[PDB]
Design a protein around this ligand. Structure first.
Ligand SMILES: [K+]
Ligand SMILES: [K+]
Ligand SMILES: [K+]
Ligand SMILES: [K+]
Ligand SMILES: [K+]
Ligand SMILES: [K+]
Ligand SMILES: [K+]
Ligand SMILES: [K+]
Ligand SMILES: [K+]
Ligand SMILES: [K+]
Ligand SMILES: [K+]
Ligand SMILES: [K+]
Ligand SMILES: [K+]
Ligand SMILES: [K+]
Ligand SMILES: [K+]
Ligand SMILES: [K+]
Ligand SMILES: [K+]
Ligand SMILES: [K+]
Ligand SMILES: [K+]
Ligand SMILES: [K+]
Ligand SMILES: [K+]
Ligand SMILES: [K+]
Ligand SMILES: [K+]
Ligand SMILES: [K+]
Ligand SMILES: [K+]
Ligand SMILES: [K+]
Ligand SMILES: [K+]
Ligand SMILES: [K+]
Ligand SMILES: [K+]
Ligand SMILES: [K+]
Ligand SMILES: [K+]
Ligand SMILES: [K+]
Ligand SMILES: [K+]
Ligand SMILES: [K+]
Ligand SMILES: [K+]
Ligand SMILES: [K+]
Ligand SMILES: [K+]
Ligand SMILES: [Mg+2]
Ligand SMILES: [Mg+2]
Ligand SMILES: [Mg+2]
Ligand SMILES: [Mg+2]
Ligand SMILES: [Mg+2]
Ligand SMILES: [Mg+2]
Ligand SMILES: [Mg+2]
Ligand SMILES: [Mg+2]
Ligand SMILES: [Mg+2]
Ligand SMILES: [Mg+2]
Ligand SMILES: [Mg+2]
Ligand SMILES: [Mg+2]
Ligand SMILES: [Mg+2]
Ligand SMILES: [Mg+2]
Ligand SMILES: [Mg+2]
Ligand SMILES: [Mg+2]
Ligand SMILES: [Mg+2]
Ligand SMILES: [Mg+2]
Ligand SMILES: [Mg+2]
Ligand SMILES: [Mg+2]
Ligand SMILES: [Mg+2]
Ligand SMILES: [Mg+2]
Ligand SMILES: [Mg+2]
Ligand SMILES: [Mg+2]
Ligand SMILES: [Mg+2]
Ligand SMILES: [Mg+2]
Ligand SMILES: [Mg+2]
Ligand SMILES: [Mg+2]
Ligand SMILES: [Mg+2]
Ligand SMILES: [Mg+2]
Ligand SMILES: [Mg+2]
Ligand SMILES: [Mg+2]
Ligand SMILES: [Mg+2]
Ligand SMILES: [Mg+2]
Ligand SMILES: [Mg+2]
Ligand SMILES: [Mg+2]
Ligand SMILES: [Mg+2]
Ligand SMILES: [Mg+2]
Ligand SMILES: [Mg+2]
Ligand SMILES: [Mg+2]
Ligand SMILES: [Mg+2]
Ligand SMILES: [Mg+2]
Ligand SMILES: [Mg+2]
Ligand SMILES: [Mg+2]
Ligand SMILES: [Mg+2]
Ligand SMILES: [Mg+2]
Ligand SMILES: [Mg+2]
Ligand SMILES: [Mg+2]
Ligand SMILES: [Mg+2]
Ligand SMILES: [Mg+2]
Ligand SMILES: [Mg+2]
Ligand SMILES: [Zn+2]
Lengths: 159, 53, 104, 62, 149, 183
RNA sequence: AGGUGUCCUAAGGGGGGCUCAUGGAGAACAGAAAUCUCCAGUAGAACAAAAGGGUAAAAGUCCCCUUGAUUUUGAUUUUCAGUGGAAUACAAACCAUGAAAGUGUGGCCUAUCGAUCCUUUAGUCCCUCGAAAUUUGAGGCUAGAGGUGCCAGAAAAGUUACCACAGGGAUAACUGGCUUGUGGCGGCCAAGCGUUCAUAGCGACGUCGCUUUUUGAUCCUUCGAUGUCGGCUCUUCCUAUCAUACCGAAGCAGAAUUCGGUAAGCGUUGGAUUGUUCACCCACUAAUAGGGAACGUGAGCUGGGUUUAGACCGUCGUGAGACAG
RNA sequence: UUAACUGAACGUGGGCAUUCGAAUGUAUCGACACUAGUGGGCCAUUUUUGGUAAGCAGAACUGGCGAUGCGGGAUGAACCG
RNA sequence: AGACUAAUCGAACCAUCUAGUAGCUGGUUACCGCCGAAGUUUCCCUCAGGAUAGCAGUGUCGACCUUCAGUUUUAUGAGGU
RNA sequence: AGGUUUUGCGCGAGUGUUUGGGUGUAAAACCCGCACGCGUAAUGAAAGUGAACGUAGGUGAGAGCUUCGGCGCAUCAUCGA
């Protein structure tokens, strides 16, 4: 049985970067969170209270509780042949709102106006994404862009 | 040993129980013997009842 | 390790239910009675022939013990018990340490 | 007298035989572990809403 | 076979040797095909290849069963709501990738071909560029279809 | 080779009764014919429940029927593929008509004494061959003493297998914090 | 490559002011090193202990006040079967500090510890001693302490050469198999030795190989058994040639010698001491070469040694007994 | 909870497919009950630790043999098909 | 001499307790059809043995529940080889 | 002998004749009913106490039926009594 402590193996993960020590920006304490938000976890080494375990560093979850100085988050952990639901308490210095769902929240309101604009006008539109398609036919002119002929080069010693 | 969810057993069969086992194959036979004795007893007490108050 | 002889902390007495002043002493176990049911049973089992009937412990490893403080309320005369960590030397009411007076 | 110490050789394949199951979600999650001060009041709020929306057929007319 | 290429071949419906299917090339399908490179050969079919494959080896998936299409009534009662009513329509929808390509191609049971009549190249598990039979040979796929069909 | 995950997979549901009752076989022949020659979804459901075992056909009481005869169901026909039992708690029986697999002696007597009538499942097919104006009722499946023992474990609040009840039977270590821990 | 079974009434809690290690330049005794002043100084100092992380109007340092190291129970995290030290966020009380916002449920974070049965203390003033009451005594209900270091937790000294049973080739002591460090044998380069003269005869510093007649390393076969030292007797095989045939080279005048090639056809001994393999002497001879064949060869012999049971000595042990003496 | 019907959670009523808002497959959806055998493993490409090395000793992902025949590698548990 | 005590002695012979116990070796009786493993996790005076989770079979029930996935694409996080 | 899950059967808020008695074509078959066992109520160490605010509650799903407005079994998730 090897050594297995709470913070074993976190030499580089929990460290602050080069030229990024000292004071914490105060906009961290001014954000607001609501039950149902989507946040990601990133441990700050300079705060030793409300720290999450090293497994959750770099994960994304959903808020389920709000208290005076922390939030409760729900994450799913894989243990061999199943998933288990975990609930962790994290101080707000370690959490951050996520941009994972912003693309979806932007397409939903853009689809609403395009649908209503088209319905008012009378011409149908697409309203869903498509993967990149193969290119089409086109003509390329040789005028004042004459091609340059290349050939492989002989071997030579550099040093 | 135990291997699943069971009720913990307590069977008192750790003595030489096979030396003291009483079957009853004479249940109908003993019933006939009792009825014959009652019939004989009633005849001896000729007009009297077969019981006491 | 030394602790003061008095301390004020919560009291659970029916009349106090607040912080009051307490006197601090050290806990000492009492002597085993000869009429406890565990003792009466043990004597009966050991009589007659057969020898020693129960285990006797031999392989000790601990060198210290946990200290237990006994506190008493100055108002209602109720008592508390508080355990400490393992220590080698202990006294209550010793001289407090001084600072900046290094004289060797 | 010496044998093998540890291995993980066949463990992944055994895990995927009956699939790796993600528990199904529900519409109403449980309120276990939420702030009790919030929970005490939220009970009263749902109670009052129940008293109304029923007299809404016997008066009030919200 | 390793687990990732195995899963992809199941989604392309290629679960047996000498099976063939039609797919439409986009960004989402070109990456799947690149992964299973040492198991497949592919290219660009022409009208003759599309025509003869469906005429000779065409089977339909009706209520879970594999049914040979010997009559136009079979096609109409399964693809009629998309405007396809005859076998000539089905060929047109495949060869010119139409608005209902997904439905038409999934109706056809995967083709079961034979081994080629003239055999393969001397070592067939190299890339076509190296001298093998794997990968993308573009319009040379037509010569291989003649021998297998 | 074909590279398939499954092969020769069998069905998970019964296809015939396991009983050998002669009259139940006649009943099954009747509803096999009805289910094939009618579009009514009602007939297919009744056929499946005639295959089931006794723990999948829990009984239904007169009280449970009276609960569902409210809010505009006063004149529908109650159908129960099970036994119908009596309830001592109910003091006044409403009038109704019920088609059931069987009735207990007191259940049948109380239904008819209030002005109702009892049917058999073959009388029902003759009067309502499509199941019109009916309501299907099931009894409580999990209200069985054996189900209380299922899935026992830590922090599960299930019932244990013990031979008696009292202070000396599994109440000391693992059940309270004054002896070690609790569950 | 290292650490733990402790240590602290402050080295715990709150508030306030200040800036550290080191360098340059100056001042009676005073100097490399005492105390005083100015300038520069991103932490190069300090924070009980091992190492890693963290910290500058502080988490360092000095000053002032205190005991959140307190009460009642639940939820969550790590090891994990999601069973049994340590940690996180709230709720309900009572407090401490600061003008205040706030902070405080022990040590800046990651280690610093213990079930059932029994004993003992604190708590309510509570339940029971079953014919009825009162006082002593005993028994229950809730929380700590006395300990299991083999640390999910028996109460425990040797010998057997007089020996026994169930098994194991999952495991040693002999052949065989892979390897070749070590042992043995053979090459390459050329500073130098050789009277001058690298290579007649040699080869320092380096470097490439071969063999399985040394010894190691491993544990694949054999423990319902493959007879375990040496000599005697007898046959055959290998060449890395001791003698014999025919030749090349020399620091080869002759004689005697030294280096090399083709070559295993033919030989390679009689004795004193030792159980010896190995060794060392006397003597003859053309010469008294090196090895394999289950370390060839016990239903071929022999039985000197080793290695059962009898017996003596020395050293060791209280003793029974031990010793590759 | 806020100086404050200001917020927080849960909702009534109304509006929005003129399109329920990437690709492919669905040759196998969910939940429960009762129980067997096993708990000596070995081999290989790539990555790797100790050792001069070993048909030596120890790990990670994946594929095999064990539990499996057939055509090749003359023979040859594990190599190619 | 651990020598002799009826071919038996580092504790004779005869009957009974007795079918003494064995985590250890050996054996374990017709055919066809369908499905099909493990040598791994945690605890144990545990290391040739058990319990516990996993892998496997059988019986079903709920709807035939727009339901899922050892995969690609698009947007967006974490990591110190 | 004592447990447990699943299949078939009888009766069903109850269920079980056979310790015993009556009777007989006599170890069979047939008949009887006072007690008793399990179930119908739990929770505490114990003294003890002991299950409806509501059409036996509200919300989201839900087979079947429907006068097409809706009613909603079994079961699952959730807030309460
Ligand atoms: K280590
Ligand atoms: K005794
Ligand atoms: K072992
Ligand atoms: K091991
Ligand atoms: K105790
Ligand atoms: K220490
Ligand atoms: K302090
Ligand atoms: K440090
Ligand atoms: K724990
Ligand atoms: K132990
Ligand atoms: K310990
Ligand atoms: K242990
Ligand atoms: K002994
Ligand atoms: K010996
Ligand atoms: K053997
Ligand atoms: K073997
Ligand atoms: K060598
Ligand atoms: K050798
Ligand atoms: K060797
Ligand atoms: K060996
Ligand atoms: K042997
Ligand atoms: K000799
Ligand atoms: K041999
Ligand atoms: K010999
Ligand atoms: K001797
Ligand atoms: K308000
Ligand atoms: K098992
Ligand atoms: K097992
Ligand atoms: K093994
Ligand atoms: K091996
Ligand atoms: K072969
Ligand atoms: K004799
Ligand atoms: K064993
Ligand atoms: K690095
Ligand atoms: K039964
Ligand atoms: K009764
Ligand atoms: K419906
Ligand atoms: Mg580590
Ligand atoms: Mg006595
Ligand atoms: Mg005595
Ligand atoms: Mg093992
Ligand atoms: Mg495998
Ligand atoms: Mg030909
Ligand atoms: Mg070829
Ligand atoms: Mg086949
Ligand atoms: Mg301070
Ligand atoms: Mg400060
Ligand atoms: Mg507080
Ligand atoms: Mg400090
Ligand atoms: Mg702390
Ligand atoms: Mg203790
Ligand atoms: Mg006690
Ligand atoms: Mg008495
Ligand atoms: Mg043996
Ligand atoms: Mg072996
Ligand atoms: Mg050498
Ligand atoms: Mg010279
Ligand atoms: Mg040399
Ligand atoms: Mg043998
Ligand atoms: Mg032999
Ligand atoms: Mg022999
Ligand atoms: Mg030679
Ligand atoms: Mg020569
Ligand atoms: Mg001699
Ligand atoms: Mg040899
Ligand atoms: Mg020999
Ligand atoms: Mg021989
Ligand atoms: Mg001898
Ligand atoms: Mg001897
Ligand atoms: Mg002797
Ligand atoms: Mg002596
Ligand atoms: Mg085994
Ligand atoms: Mg290995
Ligand atoms: Mg091995
Ligand atoms: Mg095997
Ligand atoms: Mg194979
Ligand atoms: Mg072959
Ligand atoms: Mg070969
Ligand atoms: Mg004799
Ligand atoms: Mg036997
Ligand atoms: Mg025997
Ligand atoms: Mg199969
Ligand atoms: Mg133990
Ligand atoms: Mg064995
Ligand atoms: Mg459903
Ligand atoms: Mg289905
Ligand atoms: Mg690293
Ligand atoms: Mg009788
Ligand atoms: Zn007090």
């Amino acid at each position: 049985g090897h050594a297995a402590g709470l913070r074993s193996g976190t030499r580089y993960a929990f460290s602050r970067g080069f030229r990024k020590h000292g004071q914490i920006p105060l906009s961290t304490y001014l954000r607001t969170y609501r039950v149902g938000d989507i946040v990601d976890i990133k441990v700050n080494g300079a705060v030793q209270k409300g720290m999450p375990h090293k497994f959750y560093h770099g994960k994304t979850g959903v808020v389920y509780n709000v208290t005076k100085s922390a939030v409760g988050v729900i994450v799913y952990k894989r243990v061999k042949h199943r998933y288990i639901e975990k609930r962790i308490n994290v101080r707000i210095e370690h959490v951050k709102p996520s941009r994972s769902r912003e693309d979806f929240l932007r397409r939903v309101k853009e689809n609403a106006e395009l649908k209503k604009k088209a319905k008012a006008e009378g011409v149908p539109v697409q309203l869903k994404r498509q993967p990149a398609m193969p290119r089409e036919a086109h003509t390329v002119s040789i005028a004042d862009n004459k091609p340059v002929t290349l050939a492989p080069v002989a071997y030579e010693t550099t040093i | 040993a135990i291997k699943h969810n069971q009720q913990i057993p307590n069977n008192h069969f750790r003595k030489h129980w096979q030396r003291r086992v009483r079957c009853h194959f004479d249940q109908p036979g003993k019933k006939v013997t009792r009825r014959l004795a009652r019939r004989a007893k009633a005849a001896a007490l000729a007009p009297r009842p077969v019981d006491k108050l | 390790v030394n602790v003061p002889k008095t301390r004020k902390t919560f009291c659970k007495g029916k009349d106090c239910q607040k912080h009051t002043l307490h006197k601090v002493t050290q806990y000492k176990a009492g002597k085993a009675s000869a009429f406890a049911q565990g003792k009466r049973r043990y004597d009966r089992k050991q009589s007659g022939y057969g020898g020693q009937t129960k285990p006797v412990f031999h392989k000790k490893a601990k060198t210290t013990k946990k200290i237990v403080l006994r506190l008493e309320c100055s108002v209602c005369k109720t008592k508390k018990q508080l355990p400490l960590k393992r220590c080698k030397h202990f006294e209550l009411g010793g001289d407090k340490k001084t600072k900046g007076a290094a004289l060797v | 007298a010496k044998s093998k110490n540890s291995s993980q050789h066949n463990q992944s394949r055994k895990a995927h035989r009956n699939g790796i199951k993600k528990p199904k979600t529900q519409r109403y999650p449980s309120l276990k572990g939420t702030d009790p001060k919030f929970r005490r009041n939220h009970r009263h709020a749902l109670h009052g809403t129940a008293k109304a929306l029923k007299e809404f057929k016997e008066g009030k007319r919200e | 076979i390793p687990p990732k290429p195995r899963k992809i071949l199941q989604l392309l419906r290629l679960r047996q040797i000498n099976n063939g299917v039609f797919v439409k090339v986009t960004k989402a399908t070109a990456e799947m095909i690149k992964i299973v490179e040492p198991w497949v050969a592919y290219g660009y079919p022409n009208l003759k290849s599309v025509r003869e494959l469906i005429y000779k080896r065409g089977y339909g998936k009706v209520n879970g069963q594999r049914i040979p299409l010997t009559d136009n009534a079979i096609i109409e009662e399964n693809l009629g709501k998309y405007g396809i009513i005859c076998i000539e329509d089905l060929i047109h929808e495949i060869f010119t990738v139409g608005p209902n390509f997904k439905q038409a191609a999934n109706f056809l049971w995967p083709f079961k071909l034979s081994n080629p009549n003239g055999g393969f190249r001397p070592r067939k598990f190299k890339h076509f560029i190296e001298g093998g039979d794997l990968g993308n040979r573009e319009e040379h796929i037509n010569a291989l279809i003649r021998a297998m069909n | 080779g074909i590279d398939l995950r499954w092969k020769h997979v069998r069905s998970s549901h019964r296809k015939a009764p396991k009983s050998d009752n002669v009259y139940l076989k006649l009943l099954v022949k009747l509803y096999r014919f009805l289910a094939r020659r009618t579009e009514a979804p009602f007939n297919k459901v009744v056929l499946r429940r005639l295959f089931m075992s006794r723990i999948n056909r829990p009984p239904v009481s007169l009280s449970r029927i009276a609960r569902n005869l409210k809010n505009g169901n006063e004149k529908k026909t109650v159908v129960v593929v099970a036994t119908v039992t009596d309830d001592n708690r109910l003091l006044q029986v409403p009038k109704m008509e019920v088609a059931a697999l069987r009735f207990t002696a007191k259940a049948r007597a109380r239904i008819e004494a209030a002005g109702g009538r009892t049917l058999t499942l073959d009388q029902l097919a003759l009067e309502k061959p499509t199941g019109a104006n009916t309501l299907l009722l099931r009894g409580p499946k999990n209200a069985r003493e054996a189900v209380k023992h299922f899935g026992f474990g830590p922090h599960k609040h299930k019932k244990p297998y013990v031979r008696s009840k009292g202070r000396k039977f599994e109440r000391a270590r693992g059940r309270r914090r004054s002896r070690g821990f609790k569950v």
